[PDB]
Amino acid sequence: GSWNQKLIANQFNSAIGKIQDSLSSTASALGKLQDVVNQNAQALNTLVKQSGLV
Secondary structure, eight states: OOHHHHHHHHHHHHHHHHHHHHHHHHHHHHHHHHHHHHHHHHHHHHHHHHSSOO
């Protein structure tokens, strides 16, 4: 078998690992962002409860 081909199969794992790591960081970042929306939405709701139609 070609030496390059042999390297490529091993290589495929490296790319996948880097991709997952890259994606992995972003997911956490997105999760943090979701919390930030919750606080803003929650604050308005809390205000509405104190004084609002419903």
